[PDB]
Ligand binder design. Structure first.
Ligand SMILES: *[C@@H]1O[C@H](CO)[C@@H](O[C@@H]2O[C@H](CO)[C@@H](O)[C@H](O)[C@H]2NC(C)=O)[C@H](O)[C@H]1NC(C)=O
Ligand SMILES: *[C@@H]1O[C@H](CO)[C@@H](O)[C@H](O)[C@H]1NC(C)=O
Lengths: 50, 51
């Protein structure tokens, strides 16, 4: 998917990636420690999956 | 019982919902630009449509 959808779903920063989840149905992939920081500071986000 | 299965049907809205139901038949132009795309694609949805 990501090879076919470059400059569409491939954001270049974490702050614009969390915002893209905050706008559309976006399922951003990143490191687990920062997700444990964002989810505890934002009650509209969650960590699904292991 | 009528009003809960006349909603639980989910008619076709994307290729993802149409990738599963092999009852509704797929289709393409024979060796055009559309058939060439699904033959070379590696996406999980679009390879099952070529199957
Ligand atoms: C869950 O909540 C809202 C209400 O339907 C949806 O959010 C909208 O999604 C569309 C689709 O991209 C956006 O254009 C709108 O700007 C969104 N509005 C708001 C207020 O967020 C959302 O899509 C719903 N469904 C999910 C997450 O699957
Ligand atoms: C999600 O929650 C945060 C803080 O709780 C809020 O600022 C934001 O507007 C909320 N977003 C939506 C789409 O409700």
């Amino acid at each position: 998917f990501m090879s076919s959808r470059r400059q569409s779903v491939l954001v270049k920063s974490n702050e614009e990636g969390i915002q893209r989840v905050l706008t559309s149905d976006y399922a951003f992939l990143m490191e687990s420690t920062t997700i444990e920081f964002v989810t505890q500071r934002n009650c509209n986000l969650t960590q699904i999956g292991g | 019982a009528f009003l809960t299965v006349e909603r639980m049907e989910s008619p076709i809205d994307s290729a993802d919902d149409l990738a599963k139901q092999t009852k509704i038949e797929y289709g393409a132009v024979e060796d055009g630009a559309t058939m060439t795309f699904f033959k070379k694609s590696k996406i999980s949805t679009y390879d099952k449509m070529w199957a």
